[PDB]
């Protein structure tokens, strides 16, 4: 599919933002369009101060480390990062390497992303609408 | 900024500051035709008086990309946006409606471009003024 690939991440003011590749006004000489998925790539080993991403183990627990290790929580259906709830790893629809995650407490709702005009931010919502994935390798 | 970007963003101030000689008017008219900015093109066609030799010298502009490759009639017939501008050159009598293109799509006429765009208004205006196909 036509997925959005994030080359960098920015944890500022207790908030992590995902930087995407520069399209550079490059257009396709084919006819089509799609933007349903996104993924973070272990470039420079950003996936396990560089704002590294941590996935722990089925079920998973998500953490961010930018000189301050902080776990993620979805309580009250609101995303929060606390320096120290549970999500399940699931196969991405129509993908083999990608991996997505669903809330343990607030089921049916999965991790997602929105657009800060210049960056991309993490949220939680149910199946405007963009889905967060991770490459399994 | 530049003249082409000033025409694209409708920066009339820097346009008028840069638009001086009629060579500059030629270049600006070609840029307005290329970017389909009919308002700027008409404002220049009124702010300046264009002749037929003006159209020839426009055809001789190797600097202007749109005029280095496309004929002025091609630029006028490219899409419907330049329609009003076209009318000027047809009403003020500056271009032959049945002139065959010589640079790009050589042999075709403006009626051929109008047929390509599938625009009823331009086809009508051309046929009413007795436009013919090029028979390439």
């Amino acid at each position: 599919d036509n997925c959005i690939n994030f080359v960098a991440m920015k944890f500022i003011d207790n908030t992590l933002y995902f930087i995407a590749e520069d399209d550079e006004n490059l257009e396709s000489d084919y006819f089509g369009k799609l933007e349903s998925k996104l993924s973070v790539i272990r470039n420079l080993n950003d996936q396990v101060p560089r704002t590294i991403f941590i996935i722990s183990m089925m079920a998973v627990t998500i953490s961010v480390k930018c000189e301050k290790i902080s776990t993620l929580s979805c309580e009250n259906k609101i995303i929060s990062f606390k320096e120290m709830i549970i999500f399940f790893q699931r196969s991405v629809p129509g993908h083999d390497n990608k991996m997505q995650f669903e809330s343990s407490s607030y089921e049916g709702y999965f991790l997602a992303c929105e657009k800060e005009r210049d960056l991309f931010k993490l949220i939680l919502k149910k199946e405007r609408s963009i889905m967060f994935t991770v490459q399994n390798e | 900024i530049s003249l082409e970007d000033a025409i694209k963003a409708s920066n009339y101030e820097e346009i008028n500051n840069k638009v001086t000689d009629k060579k500059m008017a030629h270049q600006a008219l070609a840029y307005s035709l290329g970017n389909k900015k009919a308002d700027i093109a008409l404002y220049l066609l009124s702010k300046f008086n264009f002749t037929k030799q003006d159209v020839a010298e426009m055809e001789k502009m190797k600097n202007n990309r749109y005029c280095n490759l496309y004929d002025v009639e091609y630029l006028l017939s490219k899409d419907g946006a330049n329609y009003k501008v076209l009318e000027y050159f047809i009403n003020n009598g500056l271009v032959d409606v049945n002139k065959k293109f010589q640079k790009v799509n050589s042999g075709d006429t403006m009626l051929d471009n109008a047929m390509k765009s599938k625009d009823s208004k331009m086809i009508d205006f051309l046929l009413k003024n007795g436009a013919i196909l090029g028979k390439r």
């Binding site: 590749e21 520069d22 399209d23 550079e24 006004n25 490059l26 257009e27 396709s28 000489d29 084919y30 | -």
Partner: protein, 87 residues
């Protein structure tokens, strides 16, 4: 009347590998045409057509913004082609 081949002395240079997309910049043109012009200006005097094309292919070896590998296809040439610029 002598015997010849139906198809001979052909060469095609596609901007990408089969099944894949080729990319174009809305401000400068297509990446493939850009690099092609670059390599022709820089090397056509001392290299032949296939060598210039290999320079082009090498300039895409490491994927920068987008990934795209122009490919040679239907190559039926028996000799080398030197454009001999400036002559």
């Amino acid at each position: 009347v002598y015997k010849t081949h139906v198809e001979k002395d052909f060469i095609a240079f596609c901007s990408s590998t089969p099944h894949n997309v080729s990319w174009r910049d809305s401000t400068m043109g297509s990446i493939f045409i850009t690099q092609l012009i670059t390599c022709f200006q820089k090397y056509s005097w001392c290299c032949h057509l296939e060598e210039v094309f290999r320079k082009v292919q090498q300039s895409f070896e490491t994927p920068r913004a987008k990934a795209q590998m122009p490919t040679i296809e239907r190559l039926s040439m028996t000799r080398y082609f030197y454009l001999f610029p400036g002559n």
